[PDB]
Design a protein around this ligand. Sequence first.
Ligand SMILES: N[C@@H](Cc1c[nH]c[nH+]1)C(=O)O
Length: 238
Amino acid sequence: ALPQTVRIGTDTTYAPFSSKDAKGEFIGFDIDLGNEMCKRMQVKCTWVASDFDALIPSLKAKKIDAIISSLSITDKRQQEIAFSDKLYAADSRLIAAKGSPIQPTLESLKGKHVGVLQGSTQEAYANDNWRTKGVDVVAYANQDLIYSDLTAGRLDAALQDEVAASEGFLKQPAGKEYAFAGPSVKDKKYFGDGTGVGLRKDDTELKAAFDKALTELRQDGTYDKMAKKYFDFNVYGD
Ligand SMILES: N[C@@H](Cc1c[nH]c[nH+]1)C(=O)O
């Protein structure tokens, strides 16, 4: 009893995973994986754009059926929703101006302005560890606003998923005077283990379907043909 139309929510401001091209078409590795999986599940899928913090609200409100939006599988989100198996890995890393002395430490960030996406694992992390100790953590509705405020000099640093910062901003004309500041921030409690399709706990059949289609496209070389369109490194991880 899979639905005949599966409505997938995504926040289209996170290139290379989910964004809009020049005519408003949804494009990116998340879109490609979702379309390919829908194909193999034999269901129709509609893509719905939403701000990132409304996506899990909308899933439990039954406005959408699935989330494919670089959604990290974390212990916390698992108490509310279910996930497919890992779609790819995602570590977090800071970016700041090239030649910034900044490092992901409280010592370095006290009194700095740090942007984080509202609702992400990075907002949770920075709120707890940095906002409480006086770092000025600013939560934004979408990641594009973050990159603009950074280039505008309103933010001193931004914390987000490393591949999205790299391919989505640092390798773009706008990110040439910026760079990663320090190494990847690793915290198992906060950042979870890779990303996955987010689903209602009770939609067990839909979870089995996405997982099966995912095993199949990985098994026949499609995942690697698809990822090579975006990445020259092993995006899936372990
Ligand atoms: N992976 C992080 C960051 C993110 C995903 N999408 C947009 N931002 C999360 O799931 O919160």
